[PDB]
Amino acid sequence: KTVVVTTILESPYVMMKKNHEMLEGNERYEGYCVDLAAEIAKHCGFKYKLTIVGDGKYGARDADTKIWNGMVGELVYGKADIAIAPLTITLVREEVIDFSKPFMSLGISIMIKKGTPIESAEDLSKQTEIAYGTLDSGSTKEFFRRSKIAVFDKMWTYMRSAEPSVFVRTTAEGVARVRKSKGKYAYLLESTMNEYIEQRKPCDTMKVGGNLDSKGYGIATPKGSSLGTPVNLAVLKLSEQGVLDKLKNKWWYDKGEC
Amino acid sequence: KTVVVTTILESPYVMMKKNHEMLEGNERYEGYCVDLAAEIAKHCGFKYKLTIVGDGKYGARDADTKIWNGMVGELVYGKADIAIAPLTITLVREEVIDFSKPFMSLGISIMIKKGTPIESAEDLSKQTEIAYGTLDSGSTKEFFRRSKIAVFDKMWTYMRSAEPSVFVRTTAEGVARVRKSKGKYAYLLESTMNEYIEQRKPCDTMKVGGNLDSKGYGIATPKGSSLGTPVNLAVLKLSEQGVLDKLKNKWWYDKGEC
Ligand SMILES: N[C@@H](Cn1cc([N+](=O)[O-])c(=O)[nH]c1=O)C(=O)O
Ligand SMILES: N[C@@H](Cn1cc([N+](=O)[O-])c(=O)[nH]c1=O)C(=O)O
Ligand SMILES: [Zn+2]
Ligand SMILES: [Zn+2]
Ligand SMILES: [Zn+2]
Ligand SMILES: [Zn+2]
């Protein structure tokens, strides 16, 4: 049985290769998670096909219907056997799917156009000249929605009602919005992405302040899947072998252009 | 049934209260892990008894007898129901006990007496004037014994054969050795401990360089135990509701003496 892997186009985790049009199957893709997938499959001994999540979302549960979308939904409804992606380990997800131990740590962070007069989340919350938002479906939005911290709740109150909307469908759209907004939009996004983007041309963005939280990405499987245990053990093995660090260095800093 | 919790006297995770001789049961202890245990218990809905691990050890498998010592052994042999302590999530332990998702991130780091001419593991590995060692049992030592990375193996090769022994029995012993050795002993230890000590009088130590690796502490339960699921969910809930961050700040920095 070939294992169906659900993933998402998000640099430098999974990207189309320069010459992908002349390539087929898994070979079209490169990135940290593409490499992680190959290692996991090697150590657990399976063959697999990478497939990009149809709706291009990470996964949230619809309030009215209670149906899960995104990569999470593909696992929940049996469309994929495993998700190998920058997928945040969260409580609401852990209730419907299984996560391995984390293969990467991260936090929510702030991205600004260079020269923007912002140093912190508190700075953002105390002003109005500069708009700010998050990836409009995923763990970061849910963080602000659920936050009982005054600074973040204040920010959520602003974001939920902002007009026009401050939420974006993809990271690419968020970043483009910072780049074109002349310093009038700051983007809240995961630190790993922020750090990658800061080192790529045109080198006009930067991460400011510390992370707003601490969490991790894990490999996800359907609850009670037989893949859950071997995969978890494979992640810890790769961590202890230094492989996760090697991949991180390969995809972030060896790819710096600034 | 009252849940038996195994833990270890290691500041500031668990410490004897000043008037402990006058107190009983759980009230004898204080620290990050005592606070965490209270929250875990409250969220899972169980009564518990804190007990200090008899042999004062974290957990290793004796190569000869194959017997597990430390907190891991107390779980494997059924002497405790759960371990709430700075216990590192590792592959070999995951094979015999269950771990929650990590409640704290960390890495192996270098502690020096202020003014020691050392900035990194490479620096340490390329010289012999300054001695260096690790806790004589635990995941840090195992990290070096197992590492296939040139620098860390070079360090291990030095450390296993160094005489007198560069290894120490307790964190306290390592720190005292740093402080007394006039810059001629550096101590390799987990970053969280390093960070704690840097804010303690006499304020004569510091963490230098990046971390050598990345990993996490997890709450541990016997394989197959029914506490595993609720406990994991409780960890994620505490992470997301900011409790883990509050606790780290309370015990590391709010008490800061430097
Ligand atoms: N990892 C998240 C998805 N996700 C991704 C990014 N991102 O890649 O910058 C983000 O800023 N916010 C977010 O919730 C999840 O799993 O929902
Ligand atoms: N957390 C470890 C134990 N452990 C603790 C410390 N520490 O408290 O400084 C250390 O420096 N090295 C180590 O292996 C494990 O679980 O074995
Ligand atoms: Zn194309
Ligand atoms: Zn491998
Ligand atoms: Zn005493
Ligand atoms: Zn609570």
Side-chain angles (χ1 to χ4, degrees), chain A residues 2-17 20-181 183-258, chain B residues 1-17 20 22-46 48 50-63 65-258:
Chain A
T2 295
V3 177
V4 171
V5 178
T6 186
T7 194
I8 189 162
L9 289 168
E10 186 79 71
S11 317
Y13 292 98
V14 180
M15 301 168 289
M16 315 259 295
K17 229 176 257 173
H20 59 277
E21 293 182 353
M22 72 195 35
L23 311 178
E24 275 200 340
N26 295 168
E27 294 311 308
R28 302 166 286 166
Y29 307 116
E30 71 180 347
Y32 176 102
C33 284
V34 182
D35 288 345
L36 182 55
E39 282 279 3
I40 295 298
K42 183 168 158 70
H43 285 271
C44 294
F46 59 82
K47 289 175 175 183
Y48 62 99
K49 295 173 184 186
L50 297 168
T51 78
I52 308 302
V53 64
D55 66 9
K57 287 170 181 289
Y58 282 84
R61 173 180 169 256
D62 183 291
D64 303 340
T65 70
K66 304 177 160 193
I67 302 189
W68 284 94
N69 64 19
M71 288 182 282
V72 177
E74 296 207 324
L75 295 178
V76 167
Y77 305 113
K79 308 316 167 63
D81 296 293
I82 193 170
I84 303 180
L87 186 62
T88 299
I89 296 166
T90 72
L91 168 73
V92 293
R93 290 169 177 172
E94 189 77 284
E95 292 176 359
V96 299
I97 61 184
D98 282 354
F99 280 104
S100 76
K101 291 303 184 301
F103 62 81
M104 199 172 295
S105 303
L106 66 308
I108 297 164
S109 62
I110 301 172
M111 175 192 287
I112 54 159
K113 191 167 182 70
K114 282 180 176 177
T116 296
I118 292 295
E119 299 187 343
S120 67
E122 287 187 8
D123 284 6
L124 278 178
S125 69
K126 292 176 186 286
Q127 60 81 54
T128 50
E129 291 180 7
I130 302 160
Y132 53 93
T134 85
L135 176 66
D136 96 322
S137 164
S139 57
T140 302
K141 195 174 173 188
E142 177 76 1
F143 174 86
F144 287 92
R145 157 138 51 231
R146 300 307 179 208
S147 180
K148 298 182 173 81
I149 295 183
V151 172
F152 310 144
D153 177 71
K154 195 169 201 296
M155 291 170 68
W156 171 249
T157 299
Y158 154 77
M159 289 188 289
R160 64 191 300 202
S161 303
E163 288 293 339
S165 178
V166 296
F167 299 111
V168 303
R169 178 170 297 266
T170 68
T171 304
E173 160 165 31
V175 179
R177 195 164 163 175
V178 178
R179 285 173 171 159
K180 301 182 172 180
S181 289
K184 295 308 176 195
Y185 185 75
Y187 186 53
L188 292 142
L189 81 168
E190 294 172 334
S191 53
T192 44
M193 249 67 40
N194 201 347
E195 292 162 358
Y196 179 74
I197 301 298
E198 183 175 338
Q199 302 305 319
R200 307 287 292 172
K201 291 164 189 189
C203 324
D204 59 347
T205 71
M206 62 183 285
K207 174 189 195 305
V208 289
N211 297 344
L212 279 55
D213 68 355
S214 280
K215 55 206 172 188
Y217 296 143
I219 291 173
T221 45
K223 258 199 171 172
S225 164
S226 74
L227 275 183
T229 288
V231 165
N232 186 57
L233 301 175
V235 170
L236 300 173
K237 185 170 199 61
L238 294 169
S239 177
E240 300 180 10
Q241 280 175 349
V243 180
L244 302 185
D245 293 331
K246 210 158 203 300
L247 291 183
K248 185 77 191 301
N249 289 325
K250 170 183 175 183
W251 286 107
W252 268 255
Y253 304 115
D254 285 340
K255 296 220 141 53
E257 306 172 327
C258 300
Chain B
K1 181 180 163 175
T2 300
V3 171
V4 175
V5 179
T6 187
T7 193
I8 192 161
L9 282 174
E10 179 87 78
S11 309
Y13 300 95
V14 182
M15 311 169 284
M16 308 303 306
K17 237 177 246 183
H20 76 84
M22 294 287 86
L23 307 175
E24 298 194 336
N26 297 161
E27 300 297 309
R28 288 170 292 170
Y29 310 104
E30 68 180 340
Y32 176 99
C33 283
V34 180
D35 281 357
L36 178 57
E39 280 286 325
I40 295 287
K42 179 162 168 79
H43 280 275
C44 301
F46 63 75
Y48 65 102
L50 300 175
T51 67
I52 301 301
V53 61
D55 63 6
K57 292 197 184 291
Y58 285 88
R61 181 179 180 257
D62 183 296
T65 75
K66 259 56 173 162
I67 292 171
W68 285 92
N69 63 22
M71 289 177 292
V72 174
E74 290 204 334
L75 299 172
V76 172
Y77 306 114
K79 308 304 181 38
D81 300 313
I82 187 171
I84 303 180
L87 183 69
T88 304
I89 298 170
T90 71
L91 170 62
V92 289
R93 291 171 177 168
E94 187 81 293
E95 291 167 358
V96 304
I97 60 180
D98 282 344
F99 277 109
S100 69
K101 297 304 187 299
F103 62 85
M104 194 173 284
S105 300
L106 66 309
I108 294 160
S109 61
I110 301 162
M111 172 191 286
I112 56 163
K113 186 171 186 60
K114 280 174 173 183
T116 299
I118 287 295
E119 296 184 347
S120 71
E122 283 188 17
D123 290 0
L124 283 175
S125 75
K126 286 177 188 297
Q127 60 80 59
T128 37
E129 301 193 336
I130 302 153
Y132 53 93
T134 78
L135 186 65
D136 105 324
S137 175
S139 63
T140 301
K141 188 184 195 182
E142 189 66 0
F143 171 86
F144 285 99
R145 156 158 35 234
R146 301 296 162 192
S147 184
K148 297 187 169 70
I149 304 193
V151 169
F152 305 144
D153 179 53
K154 192 172 197 287
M155 294 176 60
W156 169 245
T157 295
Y158 154 82
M159 288 182 302
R160 66 186 310 185
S161 299
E163 288 289 305
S165 180
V166 290
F167 303 105
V168 296
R169 296 178 178 179
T170 72
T171 303
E173 189 172 346
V175 173
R177 187 165 172 174
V178 170
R179 283 166 170 170
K180 297 176 183 180
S181 298
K182 302 173 174 199
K184 299 298 175 181
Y185 183 82
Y187 186 43
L188 290 148
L189 82 170
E190 295 179 327
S191 56
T192 47
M193 231 74 36
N194 204 345
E195 285 159 351
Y196 171 75
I197 300 295
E198 191 171 329
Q199 308 304 332
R200 305 313 290 187
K201 289 168 170 193
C203 308
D204 58 353
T205 67
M206 63 185 278
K207 174 196 191 305
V208 291
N211 287 347
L212 285 63
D213 70 354
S214 297
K215 49 192 161 197
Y217 299 146
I219 290 158
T221 50
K223 256 208 191 172
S225 157
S226 72
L227 280 181
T229 300
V231 162
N232 189 57
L233 293 183
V235 169
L236 297 179
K237 192 174 169 71
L238 301 175
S239 167
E240 288 169 23
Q241 283 169 335
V243 167
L244 306 185
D245 292 331
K246 240 146 180 287
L247 290 176
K248 185 95 186 302
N249 289 335
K250 166 180 185 193
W251 291 100
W252 266 254
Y253 303 118
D254 290 341
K255 294 205 161 52
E257 292 177 325
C258 312

